Symmetry: D3
Subunit: 221 residues, 6 copies
């Protein structure tokens, strides 16, 4: 019940559904989510994944009341992020994993890693400056403040800002455009994009992971 799995015209929709916890990523939810992603990639009759949250929050990150390794699988099928509300810390990283982002007017983005005293391990310190710019990323990370939907459109984090009631329709519309194209070309091309992006981000992703472990180790002392 914590993850809603929908299939509609070769589009797989994943909805984070723990709204009483701001859709926080518990161990059970993380397990089911990444398994769902792998299930979609293996599924021959699925072409596009849409990622969204149950209103009013997208994902507030990992469950803090409950409590690490990167688990997003290698995919040839596009994941569209439909950000219905606040994407915070761990949830911001989920959004950064996506190929295409689409925001509601009510979407907000924040990185509170430094506030809660933990260092990122899901590529934020690489992908955030990559997709919003260096200056803004450092401002977001160091302050912990919210970025607005309009500011996210101006910075390039999202491709479009739509009225709340048209978030999911807009996402299926883009998804339909992808399903209409040559699938083999689409997947080979996306695979190329991923491969190229991987070549550019790999060194940074390793440096992030080192900084995180060293911070944890230094903390234990």
């Amino acid at each position: 019940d914590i993850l809603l799995i929908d299939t509609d015209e070769r589009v797989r929709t994943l909805t984070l559904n723990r709204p009483q916890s701001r859709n926080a990523l518990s161990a059970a939810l993380r397990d089911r989510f990444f398994a769902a992603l792998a299930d979609a990639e293996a599924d021959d009759d699925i072409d596009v994944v849409i990622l969204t949250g149950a209103d009013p929050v997208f994902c507030a990150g990992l469950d803090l009341k409950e409590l690490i390794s990167p688990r997003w699988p290698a995919m040839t099928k596009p994941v569209i992020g439909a950000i219905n509300g606040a994407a915070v810390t761990g949830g911001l990283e989920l959004a950064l994993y996506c190929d295409i982002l689409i925001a509601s007017e009510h979407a907000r983005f924040a990185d509170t890693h430094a506030r809660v005293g933990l260092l990122p391990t899901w590529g934020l310190s690489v992908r955030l400056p990559q997709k919003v710019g260096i200056g803004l990323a450092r401002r977001m990370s160091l302050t912990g403040d919210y970025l607005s939907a309009t500011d996210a459109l101006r910075a390039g984090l999202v491709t479009e800002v739509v009225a709340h009631d048209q978030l999911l329709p807009t996402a299926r519309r883009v998804a339909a455009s992808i399903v209409g194209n040559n699938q083999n070309a689409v997947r080979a091309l996306l695979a190329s994009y991923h491969r190229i992006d991987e070549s550019q981000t790999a060194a940074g992703l390793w440096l992030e992971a080192c900084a995180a472990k060293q911070f944890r180790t230094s903390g234990d002392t």
Copy 2:
């Protein structure tokens, strides 16, 4: 005829001229254009090159009708700035032509699109590398997978073009920018741009190689 060549105040203007074929890059036009670029680079009496198309289309890409009866990169190393005056639609191969330019200035009528996935080809002129680097990851992947048009204003918002002007002011604006460059220290200008090109390829080389191998691999199947 298919390529018009003008010289004025140390500025070399190259105009794609197959309006009945939407300035599509035929074998003939390619050989002229790339020979024309080498001509300008070798000419000390030339400091700035302006690339544009005959109205209303900039370049519809490669002539895929000619290929139906029958593509490594050929853009030569240059120390002279190439200004793209995008007068209309720059699609697929024509988009890559635009991506090659150092500076892009758009008409109100200018629009951009990648239809590689519609026609079952993978790019070989740096699109999967230059497009994300110039319009952002999210927007680039949305353009490549849907095949939809990006407008002039959205190209301005995303950083693809440096300016959007009234249609009859397109080339006057381009020649004005050119005049500023022609106004500066040419040794410094050429040494600086050479450094820019040097630094850029130090960052895109690996990606360009991966794009090429993906294309070859895809052609093979």
Copy 3:
């Protein structure tokens, strides 16, 4: 006096104070500025640094009056404390490179950005050819570098060069508000995260920074060679 140094609520403000010379970085000012940054990094009572200029100019670059073709090495030290650049006016050439060094930029409505290296006959050595396209985009950086024309505050905003454009008298207060909410954070996590950001950036810009320096060295060598004949 040519450099104003203020401390308030764990925030160190550095003000370039040669207004009669448009805050041009003379030899004496470069020595004191880079010394000031090192102090801030070494001072345990400092968490955030604010860099700004005395009105109406932020910084017009190197003092070209007081200097064969001048070769100037980069001196900006490694830091774990964030540096906020409050761009109050014109940031030109060398001053533009000072701004690109900053972690966070906040622009006045009067802020302007320009690169006149090609116009005076020198190649950059403080990271411009690497950082400028990194932060404003490739097309915009090359247009700026080759023309020498000014980039406005609002154009800089949509390009990503600055995070915010505020009314002129709100510039410093905005810079201090951002500083305060950084100061209000976990300082171990802040400095560990910024150190990480710097490391990742360094691993991405190193090759470029070297190629810039070589191109500069190679350009000065020709210039002297030509001049001596």
Copy 4:
């Protein structure tokens, strides 16, 4: 008849067989060779490829009397090079593609690209300094002189130098060691090695290809 295809205990042996042309790589031989490689990778009951030449020459390179693009496919199965004799220019590049090299006492290595007035396009200028050292590679490439089997062992180009009659037995012995191991681990590990090597060589491979095209273009002038 120009390529000998052998299958023995899950080991696929490819023998270049145009000894009257020093096993030169004609168009027909290149077509059959790379198809053979792809056939071996797709073959489920094949674990290892052994590459060798018909005595007394390994491969003298491309057929010059007859007359370009890299065609070596992505593989998860190990290719062992059994160098029976002279590996020259194009043939040296074939040897450099292999995962493991084993030399006869009669094996020799030479790069005559500069002598015949053509620039390499199969990774020599990247892989040769990678596997024999920078100083030796530049000496080989600039002079065109032969490298001895013993000097190749001292430089790291080959892993072992055996008596001529034990070249192929030694190769099948190593091949048998690989067939004896966990295949899934072996292939995943080799795939990792290839991926890592690709990240380090991609930028160079693209720069080589550019230098080659620019040399061809400059030649036409």
Copy 5:
């Protein structure tokens, strides 16, 4: 007991001490060893660290028997040179321990091997990156796929170890090298090594990330 710790003339000697388990890295031994390294790095009265094993085995790798009843990298950033005195077999995980050292000196009895493919695991301590970088591509891939032993002299020939000495001269030789380092300007020594480490990771970071992802991906299946 499982890890002996000696201090002599500003040299810190770390001796793996589970000879009944062939110095296999159990959970206990790992925690001691990596804590011991952090101790040495923090101690200003220490300039050089010597890593060695209790005869006749250096380190048989991780204790896979302990794991049978139940592995991210943990080697900390150091400005002090770590000398590996390989006294015997350095296998798999123990090989990676050796690969971490700045300087390797081998006994006549020292031998090296990678059995990751025999036991169905993929490396996580940098083997697929450091092994090829230190013994060459061809030799590294032959070692990883066959699981065979590389001898001391062949390790000397390939560049893995800087020297091979008589067995009773192993540690005297190591302390002699250490004494030369202890003899130099320590600020310069530590600044230089820090630069070496910096430059090295600038070249291996991407590869280390790829190794980690390959391991995780392989574990997943």
Copy 6:
């Protein structure tokens, strides 16, 4: 006189000629050597350059007698013509870096290699921390750098640092034979290929070279800071 310049069969030989000072690179010698290389690159009648030293030493490095902590920028120019290093004797520190700059090394039986940077209290600026491990291996380079001990000609041979070790009186003749068979090649293809080799190497060493320079700048800064107190 401190630099001997010979031309024979399209081969330019450069001989470091300060034997009484172990061919130490003084300010005057550095100026003339790097000027000589540029001439060779510019001379259409030259195809190959040979660098060697007057016996018994190849080069003992920078003249430390004639010089706060000295900062020396890299000056080795971009070249499309191969440079053969005929290592006749000791190549120490700075002289070691001269050798690593060469495309091809040929060692005398008397050739020795050492790095004494750590011993005299300076960090390298001519590419040692990047090129030395690139050409002799990581373990061997670090052992060399941290100890300052000598590497012998034959040990250098098996490590890959030199392509060949010959009898002393055969050194130059060997270097000329290699040169002659380069000269006997297609000179367009030779220079296009070497230019390509250099470009690929540059794209692999740039980041490292920048990190070396920063580490050196950062080390000198501390050294002066400590000394001034």
